[PDB]
Structure 1
């Protein structure tokens, strides 16, 4: 492959001040904070992530740092730098609105069709960039999408992300805790992960957003999910979903991974829908909903139903 000439920035403990704890969970912890770089009249809102010092807990964080310092896209979380204290700290940008799962739940009655369809375009842009950089996320879910502003989301959690060689097209995992309700059938039965198994996970992510934060296959144990998907059974059509949006989800869940749409196609599809959002999502209250010419397929010609902007047409 090409040389990865990315720069790993190492930060002084003194340069940044913690403020509050954000989470507890599996991972490590995660704190809110401020980063005042040395001799710069700049104060950067940051999120400091750590793990308890174990040689395995320091190795896993540095592999994540490797991935995060390589990526650079408006819809992908970037690493600001690392701090080399007893316990290694990952310093990333603060996403003041938290994760997208918690946000759809907390704001269930204020989210309109324009917002949902735009997060779908943004998640597909971030995932396409990862496909370009030959990275397989392996953990795409709504909890792993952070909110910078309600109008701007970014993909996070690279703690499972795998890079592929130019003469490599699959990642064969050996073992480890895996979220089964988001996994592709080939991933559950053969431990194979491709960008196309990420497209499956994208389908469940869109489903979580469309159901305003519902749990996929609720009340159904993990051991049973592999069978359900073998029969032909998929997740239900959400109430707000027209058959157009649902057909896209259903395609992300084909048994043949090559039949599923590509992330560049998912961008085009959700972009067209975002130009007339009320034709694709039926939400009670849409016209009067807020979260604190130029944006419709009208403009000046014929049937501009298939009009895509160049920024959405990636190849």
Structure 2
């Protein structure tokens, strides 16, 4: 029942790209801002380069798994892997997203973020997630931190590090114990290590909550061990001040105990899209009207660089 995965994995010469400056640091890897020039193509492509420290064979296995997933996705609302460089250190080359992660963007820019941007971001994430479902991909780590901003107008889902691809036959994926973001997790996943597209939907609800609260941490001041019981009791994240009941009810649905009664991503696209048509009706934000948000000769965005 499973179709062949015919995605190309592109191997890139080290010489083809130059790191310009560091973006983020981890012992495991450091992401770099960079320029990519395909050999003799006359284009420059802004990129983010993730290269691992001097690191374990296991570390190299995980990075390759990430590369496999990223190579296999092509959607406007998903980040895609441009290629990999097989140096002494393995490097993932990705499209640069100039405005960084969405979680940082909302926190930084709250005073200038209108209802239209929020509702639109919600539609875009739903579109990306729906695409992943079409691809039978369960992301397993959806969060504001894992959404990137190409422009304030355009966002893409990222971080396929925990991402798992379902067999056509099998709905659910059962996970060996590993470090997890409980606060974004569905209850069934927390209790049983069970992940589904519907479980992704619970995560989406939390992500929406994060955007509506302009980057607040969910269940702040509460230990992860506690969270499972709290949900069991029936506690849920509080309605955000900007949110109307219409928006909030959607989040609540995402957090329902019965996974099937939760909304489909395709539905989420429809509902948010209607709201986006008249944003002030569904999100109440002070001063909504006033706010506005944002050799290079041969530079081309990755989205415009095809094969």
Deviation at 1:164, TM superposition (A): 0.6
Deviation at 1:310, TM superposition (A): 26
| Aligned mates of 1:10, 1:305 — CA distance in 2 | 26
Deviation at 1:190, TM superposition (A): 0.3
| Residue equivalent to 1:314 | 306
Superposed CA deviations along residues 51-72 of structure 1, whole A, max 9, x for unmatched, are 2321001100111100000000
Q: 1:210 to 1:55 in 2, by over 3 A?
A: same
Q: 1:312 to 1:91 in 2, by over 3 A?
A: closer
Q: 1:313 to 1:238 in 2, by over 3 A?
A: farther
Superposed CA deviations along residues 145-170 of structure 1, whole A, max 9, x for unmatched, are 00000000000000001001111000
Q: 1:27 to 1:155 in 2, by over 3 A?
A: farther
Deviation at 1:25, TM superposition (A): 3.6
Deviation at 1:306, TM superposition (A): 44
Q: TM-score, normalised by structure 2?
A: 0.94
Deviation at 1:179, TM superposition (A): 0.4
| Residue equivalent to 2:238 | 236
| Residue equivalent to 1:152 | 154
Gaps of 5+ in 1: 293-302
| Aligned mates of 1:314, 1:70 — CA distance in 2 | 15
Deviation at 1:311, TM superposition (A): 19
Q: 1:211 to 1:305 in 2, by over 3 A?
A: farther
Tell me the C-alpha RMSD between the 2 structures: 6.9
What secondary structure does 2:67 align onto? helix
Q: 1:85 to 1:213 in 2, by over 3 A?
A: same
Superposed CA deviations along residues 187-241 of structure 1, whole A, max 9, x for unmatched, are 0000000000000000000000000000000010111000110000000000000
Deviation at 1:275, TM superposition (A): 0.2
| Residue equivalent to 2:111 | 109
Runs of 4+ in 1 over 6 A off after TM superposition: 303-315
Any conservation in 1 of the 2:43–2:298 contact (CA below 8 Å)? no
Superposed CA deviations along residues 15-69 of structure 1, whole A, max 9, x for unmatched, are 0000111111475221000001100110000000122321001100111100000
What secondary structure does 1:50 align onto? strand
What secondary structure does 1:67 align onto? helix
Any conservation in 2 of the 1:234–1:253 contact (CA below 8 Å)? yes
Q: TM-score, normalised by structure 1?
A: 0.92
Any conservation in 1 of the 2:47–2:94 contact (CA below 8 Å)? yes
Gaps of 5+ in 2: none
Superposed CA deviations along residues 269-303 of structure 1, whole A, max 9, x for unmatched, are 000000000000000000111001xxxxxxxxxx9
Q: 1:82 to 1:308 in 2, by over 3 A?
A: closer
Any conservation in 2 of the 1:272–1:306 contact (CA below 8 Å)? no
Q: How many residues align?
A: 305
**Larger relative contact order (CA 8 Å, sep ≥ 6):** 2
Any conservation in 1 of the 2:28–2:55 contact (CA below 8 Å)? no
Moved more, 151-160 or 17-26: 17-26
Any conservation in 1 of the 2:104–2:145 contact (CA below 8 Å)? yes
Any conservation in 1 of the 2:44–2:299 contact (CA below 8 Å)? no
